[PDB]
């Protein structure tokens, strides 16, 4: 484990998906690996839980 990312971009989610929406300035935890472009996580934001891209991320240390 230790795996953390950070936004540096923001996205909406659309309704009736498993993603989260964020803004820049969240950070995410690793919580599961998929295999399309997207990672299971939670947002600290809220403690929200699903889908994030890795599109529009940094692979932090934090």
Known sequence: GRRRVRAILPYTKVPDTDE???LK????IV???????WM???NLRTDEQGLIVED???EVGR
């Not at 300035?25 to 995410?28: E, L, S, V």
């Not at 919580?31 to 472009?37: A, F, Q, R, S, V």
Request: hydrophobic share 45%; glycine share 10%; net charge negative.
């Open 25 to 28: 300035g969240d950070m995410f």
């Open 20 to 22: 989260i929406s964020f």
């Open 40 to 42: 299971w996580v939670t």
């Open 31 to 37: 919580h599961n690996e998929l295999e399309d472009g």
């Open 56 to 58: 529009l991320v940094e």
